[PDB]
Symmetry: C4
Subunit: 23 residues, 4 copies
């Protein structure tokens, strides 16, 4: 499902940003 | 599956909100 | 997939916790 | 079995762990 695939990419991005935001 | 679809929408929302919370 | 169903529930939970902490 | 979706699932579970530990 493209909605699930899109949420997958976004959740990967979210953790990257959250880690960078804590660094 | 409705639960996976719901979490997908919710994860999209989550990142939007978090980004805004930092801006 | 139990990983995907589990991450769905956990993702819903994470957003609920973020909102509560925000509110 | 989509590796994107499995990866994001694993990452989403870790994200919550980090958030909770950062909360506690
Ligand atoms: C909401 C999660 N980040 C989640 C992770 C995986 C991708 C999508 C759907 C579900 C599995 C739940 C988003």
């Amino acid at each position: 499902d493209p909605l699930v695939v899109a949420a997958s990419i976004i959740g990967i991005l979210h953790l990257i940003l959250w880690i960078l935001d804590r660094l």
